[PDB]
């Protein structure tokens, strides 16, 4: 191990999940997003596609996951098609990762259902 040496940082109070992954090859991902200052609604994840670098990494980004801000960046002020941007933006620069600040959604989950005896 080398060429390294290096070590800072500092997580923010909040007990928000963190998503990091990195760009394919061409800088593509297999998630995809909806919502935005256009809508004055959160980007909230749609649909999310396997064999990609968004299903494969971990925290996996499930269905749900609310994306709050965007390596760092307040992209709420952002209209989808901004946002979209946005995100490719990262490709341009190397150093430096694809992070996604999400928040968890806690809640309880009962089901039950149960069908009588024709005889």
Do not use: W
């Not at 800088?27 to 990609?52: E, L």
């Not at 341009?92 to 959604?105: A, C, I, K, Q």
């Amino acid at each position: 191990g080398s060429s390294g040496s290096s070590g800072n940082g500092g997580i923010p109070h909040d007990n928000l999940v963190l998503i990091r992954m990195k760009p394919d090859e061409n800088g593509r991902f297999g998630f995809n997003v909806k919502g935005g200052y256009d809508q004055k609604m959160p980007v909230i994840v749609s649909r999310v596609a396997p064999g990609t670098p968004a299903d494969l990494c971990v925290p996996r980004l499930n269905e749900g996951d609310q994306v709050v801000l965007i390596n760092g960046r307040d992209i709420a002020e952002h209209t989808h098609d901004q946002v979209v941007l946005f995100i490719k933006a990262s490709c341009e620069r190397h150093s430096g990762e694809l992070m996604l600040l999400v928040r968890p959604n806690a809640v309880y989950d009962v089901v039950e259902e149960s069908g009588p005896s024709s005889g």
